[PDB]
Amino acid sequence: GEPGAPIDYDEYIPGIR
Amino acid sequence: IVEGSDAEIGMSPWQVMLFRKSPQELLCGASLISDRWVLTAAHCLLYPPWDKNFTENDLLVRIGKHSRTRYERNIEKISMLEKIYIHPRYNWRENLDRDIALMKLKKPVAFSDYIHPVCLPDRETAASLLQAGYKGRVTGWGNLKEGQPSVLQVVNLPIVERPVCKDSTRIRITDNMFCAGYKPDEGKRGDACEGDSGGPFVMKSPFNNRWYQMGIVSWGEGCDRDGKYGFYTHVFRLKKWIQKVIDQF
Amino acid sequence: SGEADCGLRPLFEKKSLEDKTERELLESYID
Ligand SMILES: *[C@@H]1O[C@H](CO)[C@@H](O)[C@H](O)[C@H]1NC(C)=O
């Protein structure tokens, strides 16, 4: 029901992968 | 792919395999979005902490493949790369923000029963499908546990509410990522894993029957760990950059 | 700019055939 991430445009050891 | 199954023939005809030329080795997954352009994760090409910095002459892509070591002549096509493009604000230092890259092929590839491009989402499609609990499909030739498969693997995974994603990791999550996978109480399992990076997270629109690429396999903590989730590049949020790159070159 | 024929698989959508797990996607969208 909730968005998994915002629906808009990008404006401007981290994990084992 | 962890806890997946073997793909049917032609089930994911946009799948691309990224190989290092010499010595030959499988590097990453990728996806076909036009007859000259391939989408993948930036960290497949540039990851300074591992002295990884592949440029165009180091790489090839295999399109239309189903076996992983077999050289399927006449059914697969091997393409050289003209240029690669890493998102200029890709952040390898902290959290892989904007983990995205484009690759232009030296020659356009002919579409076939086994080679066909996936769609990129528009605003209406993204809002309709990118909802917690809605399932996408991930495919790859990566490891099945933290062995390797004989055939392209596929697994379906639900998008997870963003507050649950944040609570699951100490990494700072940006708006250019979402996470997916089953929660500990849901019974089913499944995840991407090492070697699946760069491959697509796709969803099928009930509105026009077309498959859309919503995400790029980016990173996770282990593979298929209870309470941990795989994170995906938010393709829609970066779509204007993709169009900017393709339109200029 | 997006190619007109994208996202339609020759061996499935174009032949009106479904693969073994795509219903699982659609069910998650409806149920
Ligand atoms: C990547 O390697 C190339 C060599 O072709 C070099 O010119 C470039 O500076 C390197 N980029 C890095 C280290 O970010």
- Which residue segments constitute the domains of chain C, with CATH numbers given? 1-31 (4.10.140.10)
B25 CA distance to ligand 1 middle (Å):
21
B5/C contact by beta carbon, under 8 A: yes
Contact in structure between B141 and B62 (CB atoms under 8 Å): no
Distance CA B242, CA B30 (A): 15
Backbone φ, ψ for residue B57 (5° rounding): -75, -10
- DSSP class per residue in chain B: -BS-EEPPTTSSTTEEEEEETTTTEEEEEEEESSSSEEEE-GGGTEEGGGTEE--GGGEEEEES--BSSS--TTTSEEE-EEEEEE-TT-BTTTT-BT--EEEEESSPPPP-SS--PPBPP-HHHHHHH-BTT-EEEEEESS-S-----SB-EEEEEEB--HHHHHHT-SSPP-TTEEEE---GGG----B--TT-TT-EEEEE-TTT--EEEEEEEEE-SSSS-TT--EEEEETGGGHHHHHHHHHH-
Catalytic residues of B: 43, 99, 197
Side-chain-side CA neighbours of residue B7 (13 Å): 29
Domain range spanning residue B73?
15-117+240-248
Contact in structure between B232 and B179 (CB atoms under 8 Å): yes
Contact in structure between B39 and B216 (CB atoms under 8 Å): yes
Enclosing H/E stretch for C25: helix C22-30
Distance CA B183, CA B57 (A): 42
Distance (Å) of CA C22 to CA B67, B146, B154: 22, 27, 11
B203/C contact by beta carbon, under 8 A: yes
Copy the structure tokens of residue B96: 């892989």
Which single residue is written with the structure tokens 């806890």?
B3
For the Cβ of B243 lying below 6 angstroms from any atom of ligand 1, the answer is no
Of C24, A12, A14, A6, nearest in space to B135 by CA? C24
B59 CA distance to ligand 1 middle (Å):
14
B150/C contact by beta carbon, under 8 A: no
- Is the backbone peptide bond immediately before B23 cis, with ω within 30 degrees of 0? yes
Q: What determination technique applies here? A: X-ray
B61: CATH: 2.40.10.10
For the Cβ of B52 lying below 6 angstroms from any atom of ligand 1, the answer is no
For the Cβ of B5 lying below 6 angstroms from any atom of ligand 1, the answer is no
B88 CA distance to ligand 1 middle (Å):
14
Side-chain-side CA neighbours of residue B72 (13 Å): 14
Residue type at position B17: M
Of B125, B137, B158, nearest in space to B202 by CA? B137
Neighboring chain C residues of B8 at a CB cutoff of 8 Å: 19-20
Distance (Å) of CA B218 to CA A17, B124, B142, B150, B233: 7, 24, 13, 23, 6
Distance CA C26, CA B203 (A): 9
* Interface contact flag, B129 C19, Cβ < 8 Å: no
CA B40 to chain centre: 6
Side-chain-side CA neighbours of residue B141 (13 Å): 21
